[PDB]
Design a protein around this ligand. Structure first.
Ligand SMILES: Nc1ncnc2c1ncn2[C@@H]1O[C@H](COP(=O)(O)OP(=O)(O)CP(=O)(O)O)[C@@H](O)[C@H]1O
Ligand SMILES: [Mg+2]
Length: 237
């Protein structure tokens, strides 16, 4: 295949990393070879959430012209799920040219069915460099108003950029009484509502565990909701 999807959001604290990880494990669970990429150069976190603790070679090394991206790809405890991890030390952050992300990531378009990029929130250089590395985009958002709005903005900036907006994800729903319902928030974003990820403590349990919820606690609500998302994402092709 070769679908490079960018997991993005306009605000933050929305659950981009959670989505990237659970979705990855979900797709890989359906026989799809997937590469989870950590595009948050300033605060690497994706690999940790995926159980890959101390990688020697990271995306930062590659973006610094220090290593070939092929040596920054690691196996994870999950089937068909590989990760392109990011370093955390400051020096690495500095020497990592975010502008090379698109060329680096797209050079992997033929070795995976899906390349899911975890993108840092915002429109700054790092965020932009990351989001603009994908061909498709998955908007992640919370049932908040200021959130649903910004995220929507970002959707267009990327649509104008040439990325195909696949739709959004309403994450954390059922967290508050004042949470915007589904269809409502749907005819607001103005893009298909691909899935509703409930506020489930199980998702947080998976995070700390280093084993995405969809796999760690299979029967949980969050787990099932992500498996469906997997189906919805696959259908879009
Ligand atoms: N639907 C949900 N129910 C319960 N907890 C959830 C959740 N979605 C995300 N979380 C939890 O909320 C925290 C923040 O999620 P996440 O790490 O994915 O955010 P993010 O990647 O968008 C942050 P940042 O902007 O810094 O990149 C995590 O600890 C995660 O386990
Ligand atoms: Mg994150």
């Amino acid at each position: 295949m070769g679908r490079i999807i960018s997991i993005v959001s306009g605000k933050g604290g929305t659950g981009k990393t959670t989505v990237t990880a659970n979705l990855s494990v979900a797709l890989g669970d359906r026989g799809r070879k997937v590469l989870a990429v950590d595009g948050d150069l300033t605060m690497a976190n994706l690999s940790l959430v995926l159980g890959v603790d101390d990688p020697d070679v990271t995306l930062h090394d590659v973006l610094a012209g220090e290593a070939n991206v092929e040596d920054a790809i690691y196996m994870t405890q999950f089937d068909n799920v590989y990760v392109l991890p990011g370093a955390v030390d400051w020096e690495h952050v500095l020497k990592a040219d975010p502008r090379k992300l698109p060329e680096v990531i797209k050079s992997l378009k033929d070795k995976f069915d899906f390349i899911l990029i975890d993108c840092p929130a915002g429109l700054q250089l790092d965020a932009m460099s990351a989001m603009l590395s994908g061909e498709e985009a998955l908007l992640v958002t919370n049932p908040e108003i200021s959130c649903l709005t910004d995220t929507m903005k970002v959707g267009i900036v990327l649509k104008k950029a040439g990325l195909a907006i696949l739709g959004f994800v309403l994450n954390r729903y059922g967290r508050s009484d004042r949470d915007i319902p589904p269809e409502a928030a749907e005819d607001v974003m103005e893009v298909p509502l691909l899935a509703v990820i409930p506020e489930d403590p199980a998702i947080r349990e998976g995070t700390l565990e280093g084993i995405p919820a969809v796999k760690y606690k299979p029967e949980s609500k969050g787990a099932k909701a992500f498996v469906k998302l997997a189906e919805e994402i696959e259908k879009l092709a």
